């Protein structure tokens, strides 16, 4: 009985997220029928620390069996697409690696990893590059997002 709604994420410079092969998202400008190739996120609202403007949340991809997860690589938190049993998920009580804080700093969304605080879902300035986990908010990358609701 978890509250999950469907949507598409877009970055502050108007890039969309698409699938780049089985376990990676990329951010690029889409025009016209290209735009039907954007990934739809099933964002499941989950239990965790609710501070001022932060709402805990999880991010799966409509029936691909995939959730966005933060894991360590070379002792560095990294964004990864993670397959999972679809009869189990979505759930309220979920492993911190799948969990993001939905921050609303301006009139825009940040997504901070719950396991790695101060690490955000980020895009590059150059289009068609990976969605990654970025360690600064005050660096040269894009951490600021718009959401557009889909049913």
């Amino acid at each position: 009985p978890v509250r999950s709604l469907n949507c598409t994420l877009r970055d502050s410079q108007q890039k969309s997220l698409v699938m780049s092969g089985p376990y990676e998202l990329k951010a690029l400008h889409l025009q016209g029928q290209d735009m039907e190739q954007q990934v739809v996120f099933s964002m499941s609202f989950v239990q965790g620390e609710e501070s001022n403007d932060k709402i805990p949340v999880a991010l799966g991809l409509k029936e691909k069996n995939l959730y966005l997860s933060c894991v360590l690589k070379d002792d560095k938190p990294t964004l990864q697409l993670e397959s999972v049993d679809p009869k189990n998920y979505p759930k309220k009580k979920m492993e911190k690696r799948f969990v993001f804080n939905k921050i609303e700093i301006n009139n825009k969304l940040e997504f901070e990893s719950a396991q790695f605080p101060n690490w955000y879902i980020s895009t590059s300035q150059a289009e068609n590059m990976p969605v990654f986990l970025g360690g600064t908010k005050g660096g040269q990358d894009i951490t600021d997002f718009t959401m557009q609701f889909v049913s």
Partner: antibody, heavy 120, light 108 residues
């Protein structure tokens, strides 16, 4: 000798068609974007369109959307700009240029440009 | 269609001294700004990408700074082969847009 070479330019009638082509030597375009940019006689640069050859993603300036078609043959290492309904306004040197964000190829190589004159 | 107002349109200066070209953005383009040198009748070549990173092979007198809306190109000391026009571009928002450029003419 990393190279983008253009051809197909020249003098056409208004309301005509012309295909420009942009051949890559010294790199494969399969993981590059090819942008087209144009420079009207005694004016600045204006962005026309771009294609990601592998994915087929295309993107047009509003002034050319509908009239022009950008495409790419990865097996010929070559990109295309099909121009239709040509007007005097499309008279320019047309450049093609490569883009790859990861390798900092931010229109680092440009073609020599091909002059397109639309006149009766 | 984000405008990129570039200034001045025309500049003049003598070999060995420093020059500043400025470029202003109609709205916020983050750090997605590049600088291009065009010799007449020739293809532009890349100098600076991502506001301030210097492209492989470019002389280290060429410098880029910027703050979200206001961006600036600096050359610390001109040399022979810098008679050119210089263009700023934003590549973070589509459509990509340029400035009308600035002609750099060497004074004698």
């Amino acid at each position: 000798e990393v190279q983008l070479v253009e051809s197909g330019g020249g003098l056409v009638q208004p309301g005509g068609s012309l295909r420009l082509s942009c051949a890559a030597s010294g790199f494969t375009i399969k993981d590059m974007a090819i942008h087209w940019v144009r420079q009207a006689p005694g004016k600045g640069l204006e962005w026309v369109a771009r294609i990601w050859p592998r994915e087929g993603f295309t993107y047009y300036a509003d002034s050319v959307k509908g009239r022009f078609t950008i495409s790419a043959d990865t097996s010929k290492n070559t990109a295309y700009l099909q121009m239709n309904s040509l007007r005097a306004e499309d008279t320019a040197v047309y450049y093609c240029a490569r883009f790859n964000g990861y390798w900092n190829y931010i229109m680092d190589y440009w073609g020599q440009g091909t002059l397109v004159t639309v006149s009766s | 269609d984000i405008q990129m107002t570039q200034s001045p349109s025309s500049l003049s200066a003598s070999v060995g001294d420093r020059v500043t070209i400025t470029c202003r953005a109609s709205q916020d383009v983050s750090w997605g700004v590049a600088w291009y040198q065009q010799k007449p009748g020739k293809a532009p070549k890349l100098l600076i990408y991502s506001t301030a990173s210097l492209y492989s092979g470019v002389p280290s007198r060429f410098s880029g700074s910027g703050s979200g809306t206001d961006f600036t190109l600096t050359i610390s000391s001109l040399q022979p082969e810098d008679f050119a026009t210089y263009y700023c571009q934003q590549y973070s928002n589509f459509p990509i847009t340029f400035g009308q450029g600035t002609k750099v003419e060497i004074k004698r």
